[PDB]
């Protein structure tokens, strides 16, 4: 038998309790980075390692810009939640 909650992966754009950020022209930070890393690494890396690179990209390369000081200079870290039981490759 296997758990009914097994083999799920939830790739969250942000940590629990936190805002998620989106750029009006480029799109959201997470999806930008996700597509970029997938495009570059989907035929070389396992999915968890791809998402880890998505994490470092969003964390290091993005910072919020706002005229509102409350929403300015903010950061974001994505949140990988894996209930997977095997490694995932897209090839």
């Amino acid at each position: 038998k296997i758990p009914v909650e097994a083999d799920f992966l939830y790739a969250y754009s942000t940590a629990p309790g936190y805002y998620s950020w989106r750029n009006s022209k480029d799109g959201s930070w997470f999806i930008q980075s996700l597509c970029a890393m997938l495009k570059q690494y989907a035929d070389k890396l396992e999915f968890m390692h791809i998402l880890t690179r998505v994490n470092r990209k969003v964390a290091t390369e993005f910072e919020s810009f706002s005229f509102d000081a409350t929403f300015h200079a903010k950061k974001q870290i994505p949140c990988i939640v894996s209930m997977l039981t095997k490694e995932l490759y897209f090839y």
Partner: protein, 139 residues
Amino acid sequence: NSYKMDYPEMGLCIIINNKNFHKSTGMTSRSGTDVDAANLRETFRNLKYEVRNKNDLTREEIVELMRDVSKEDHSKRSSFVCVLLSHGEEGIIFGTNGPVDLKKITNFFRGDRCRSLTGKPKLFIIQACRGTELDCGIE
């Protein structure tokens, strides 16, 4: 070991792109989300997924979509991908007219409820808020 990824199909890629919300919700337009939905579409097309783009779905429309998708036959599919682009809260994704529990959405595809996906990877990509906390960062 690794998930069997050489089924006839790679699987579905369901992209739910909510940009515009009813004025009763008071929620603002999510400018830039079309850029996301299009980039996702291209990325997963190249990964050989059967991509389905959905735009501005109500809370009721999302549920029935995910339910109908769960009652499809994924027998010759390697995996399942769902991407959610909308406003959110912790455990909540927003339809154009109101909130939807993420659990209710994901529960459709549990091993005992979606038999044709049992033992196969079910990926949910969520681009939404999970609360109202701000990360101020560190040098």
